[PDB]
Amino acid sequence: HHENLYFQVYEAAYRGRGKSWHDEAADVADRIRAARPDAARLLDVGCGTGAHLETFATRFPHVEGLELAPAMLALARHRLPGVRLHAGDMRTFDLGVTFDAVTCLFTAVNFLGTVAEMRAAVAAMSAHLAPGGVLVLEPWWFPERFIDGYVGGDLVREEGRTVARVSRSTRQGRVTRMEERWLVGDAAGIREFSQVGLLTMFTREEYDAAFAAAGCESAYVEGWLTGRGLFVATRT
Amino acid sequence: YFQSMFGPEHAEVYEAAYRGRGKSWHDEAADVADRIRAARPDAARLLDVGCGTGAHLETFATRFPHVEGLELAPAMLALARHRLPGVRLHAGDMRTFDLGVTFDAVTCLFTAVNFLGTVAEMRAAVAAMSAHLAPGGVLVLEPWWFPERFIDGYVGGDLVREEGRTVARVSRSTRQGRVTRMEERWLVGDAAGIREFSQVGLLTMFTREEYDAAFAAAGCESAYVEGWLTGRGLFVATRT
Ligand SMILES: C[S@+](CC[C@H](N)C(=O)[O-])C[C@H]1O[C@@H](n2cnc3c(N)ncnc32)[C@H](O)[C@@H]1O
Numbered sequence: 466h467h468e469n470l471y472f473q474v475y476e477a478a479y480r481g482r483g484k485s486w487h488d489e490a491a492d493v494a495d496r497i498r499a500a501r502p503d504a505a506r507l508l509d510v511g512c513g514t515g516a517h518l519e520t521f522a523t524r525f526p527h528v529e530g531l532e533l534a535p536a537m538l539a540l541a542r543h544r545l546p547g548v549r550l551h552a553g554d555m556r557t558f559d560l561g562v563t564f565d566a567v568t569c570l571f572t573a574v575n576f577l578g579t580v581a582e583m584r585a586a587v588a589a590m591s592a593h594l595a596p597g598g599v600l601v602l603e604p605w606w607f608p609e610r611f612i613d614g615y616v617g618g619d620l621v622r623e624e625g626r627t628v629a630r631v632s633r634s635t636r637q638g639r640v641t642r643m644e645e646r647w648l649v650g651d652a653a654g655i656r657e658f659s660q661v662g663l664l665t666m667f668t669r670e671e672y673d674a675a676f677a678a679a680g681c682e683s684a685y686v687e688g689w690l691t692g693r694g695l696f697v698a699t700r701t
Numbered sequence: 702y703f704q705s706m707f708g709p710e711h712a713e714v715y716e717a718a719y720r721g722r723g724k725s726w727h728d729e730a731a732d733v734a735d736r737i738r739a740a741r742p743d744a745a746r747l748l749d750v751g752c753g754t755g756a757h758l759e760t761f762a763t764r765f766p767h768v769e770g771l772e773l774a775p776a777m778l779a780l781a782r783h784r785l786p787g788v789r790l791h792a793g794d795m796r797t798f799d800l801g802v803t804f805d806a807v808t809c810l811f812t813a814v815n816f817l818g819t820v821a822e823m824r825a826a827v828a829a830m831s832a833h834l835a836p837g838g839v840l841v842l843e844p845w846w847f848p849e850r851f852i853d854g855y856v857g858g859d860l861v862r863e864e865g866r867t868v869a870r871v872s873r874s875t876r877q878g879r880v881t882r883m884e885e886r887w888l889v890g891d892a893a894g895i896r897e898f899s900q901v902g903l904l905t906m907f908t909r910e911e912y913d914a915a916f917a918a919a920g921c922e923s924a925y926v927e928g929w930l931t932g933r934g935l936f937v938a939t940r941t
Pocket residue numbers: 510511512513514515516517531532533534537553554555556570571572573576577
């Protein structure tokens with residue numbers, strides 16, 4: 466007989482829906498080490514809450530983060546005691562040092578609006594790679610793969626609350642419109658919440674072209690733990 | 702924001718929810734039909750009062766030659782006709798309807814009577830239904846009782862994923878006296894988009910003493926069946 470309980474914002478939500486930043490980071494680290502057994506320096510770009518980095522730190526002596534939103538740069542530092550974090554734009558940063566690996570996960574690069582912007586980002590990351598360094602990038606769905614009008618839904622049971630969520634994803638051009646609507650029922654009442662988020666899709670040929678332009682040989686791992694696959698490139 | 706219950710949106714999703722939690726209108730109607738035959742072996746004409754979508758009536762029709770329905774919300778009576786092409790269905794109020802005809806049995810199931818607000822209204826309903834009974838006719842009524850655990854408040858949640866639509870529901874019910882305040886909030890996502898609609902309803906309990914008095918006031922000898930397939934038991938009365 467025993468019981469568990471946790472207590473005390475996007476990350477909590479995806480964790481409740483079943484996402485494991487730890488398993489993802491571990492798998493990513495295994496693959497980085499496959500290509501680069503001596504990897505020691507890692508930079509996570511668009512780290513957000515730094516959940517991935519929490520696990521990367523257990524695997525690489527030195528790890529760093531790059532983040533544009535200072536509200537998230539706050540939370541990451543809090544959860545990441547010994548981690549050097551930099552405020553910056555992925556499209557523009559320069560830190561004067563190389564890394565054995567640069568990661569860009571959970572569709573972070575798809576927060577850029579144009580192919581010209583994504584290619585500048587991919588080139589920046591590649592610039593911070595030492596020779597043979599590994600670039601890892603989790604892309605947002607490929608236009609060919611993107612179901613349109615896709616409707617998702619999940620029911621999460623939290624402490625004191627039941628949460629319903631229905632989503633709908635639509636496209637206009639290359640831009641993807643995810644409409645999320647939550648229902649939160651608890652002691653005080655039922656609250657409704659609605660969100661929309663926009664990610665700009667790129668094609669496999671577009672990523673592959675951006676890698677090559679920045680001197681990296683790319684490969685794509687179908688599926689992976691998220692469903693969106695994984696690019697693993699090396700800077701030749 | 703809030704609408705009244707049993708509108709068109711509610712009618713579309715109303716059965717999906719209770720079936721997903723394990724309700725079988727078929728088994729209920731079948732059991733009800735068996736008991737009607739116990740008390741009235743020759744029963745042939747049946748009327749379901751507050752039939753809603755007619756889910757019960759669907760199985761009653763396979764068991765009784767002539768079957769009819771009475772329903773106030775036209776959105777529920779619409780789907781009722783849809784599901785029951787050749788069945789005379791009537792728009793009416795439980796408290797006042799008059800169809801000029803008697804039946805061998807009149808049913809009022811799934812706490813339909815407890816959507817009335819006062820004891821006087823239930824007694825008018827119970828008296829109206831009894832007027833539509835032939836001598837020896839059977840009245841069967843599923844009353845609302847408070848679940849053993851529902852002391853103050855309850856929060857429910859449901860997600861059914863169908864092919865072509867997903868339906869989410871968060872509910873909240875609070876109790877005070879004999880009144881339960883039902884707040885339901887739905888999310889339907891489908892080909893066309895994401896729709897939300899919200900409802901509030903009042904369910905009012907009546908006492909065993911009140912039912913027994915309403916039946917007697919209406920010329921009926923009553924009896925109560927413990928438990929039943931829902932948990933709320935079942936009143937079965939006969940028209941002397
Ligand atoms: C959901 S993604 C973060 C993915 C993160 N690795 C995770 O899994 O939690 C959003 C983050 O990307 C960062 N980001 C977006 N555009 C950026 C840009 N141009 N330069 C740097 N960071 C950027 C923002 O700061 C934001 O915190």
